[PDB]
Symmetry: C3
Subunit: 112 residues, 3 copies
Amino acid sequence: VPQEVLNLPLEKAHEEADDYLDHLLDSLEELSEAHPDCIPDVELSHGVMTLEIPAFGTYVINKQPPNKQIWLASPLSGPNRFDLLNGEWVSLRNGTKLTDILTEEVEKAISK
Amino acid sequence: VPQEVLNLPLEKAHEEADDYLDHLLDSLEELSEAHPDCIPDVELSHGVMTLEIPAFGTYVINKQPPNKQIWLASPLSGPNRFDLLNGEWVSLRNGTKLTDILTEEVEKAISK
Amino acid sequence: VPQEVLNLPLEKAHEEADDYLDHLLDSLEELSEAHPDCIPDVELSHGVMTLEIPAFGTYVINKQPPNKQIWLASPLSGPNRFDLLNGEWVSLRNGTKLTDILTEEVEKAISK
Ligand SMILES: [Fe+2]
Ligand SMILES: [Fe+2]
Ligand SMILES: [Fe+2]
């Protein structure tokens, strides 16, 4: 029906998890320089980000069917699950920011 | 198995987004009278509500697969996403009520 | 690609609703002893828990596609819907704990 809509420069919105992972990647392979040799590889395959931190292990950040969308598999802090609260990604278990976590775990790996 | 259940006047529950859109429509095509000629059409196609406000443009309210269920496409305030908090629909971005928004945008369109 | 992952004792995570229902069942068929003859049966069919409380009726606890995952059908307090807040299951309508509800409804059935 509504002709007035489809004459706009329309676009489908992004998956809100997709927006974060893309932002995470470039803000991680820019951080893959300030490694001594300690955060060698970042790779976003196809909705799956893999991070290698040889001190801790292999990270897996994952885009997941609901019951809340972003999946953390940390070889240090274990698994966790995140969805939107007020625009940042938040743990279903305790309420901790996803960003805040790999902030610590990366800046510990660089330090140690 | 459990025979005691299926002798009740059973019914499948409604989609909680469906309950809102139905309530929104009649509470909008009742509001499509107090237009000068300024909020001409409301139409709920099949899970898609279309609102025409010629001042701003064509609105689209939409029922969306999870990562949170009701989708706002406002030609004035942009796009947004809503799910249940304590029984009212709330923006994933900032936390604003969906009802509270098209309250303003309609009562501005009538005013101006 | 990432060889370091798949040499771990890997396992797929559980459905967070599944973890609760399993915990609910054994913590209910242990409670199906301290009935006079008043909470006779508990049964978890296949993602569907059925509770018979002859005073009130037949309960149905249910695992549901998102727009929030655990479904309560109480013959006393009506229907409700639950998802994770800070690690416990919470009503979309009002914000009440799922655990807190069948706590009351069971310990009323034993009492009365
Ligand atoms: Fe892992
Ligand atoms: Fe639009
Ligand atoms: Fe029932």
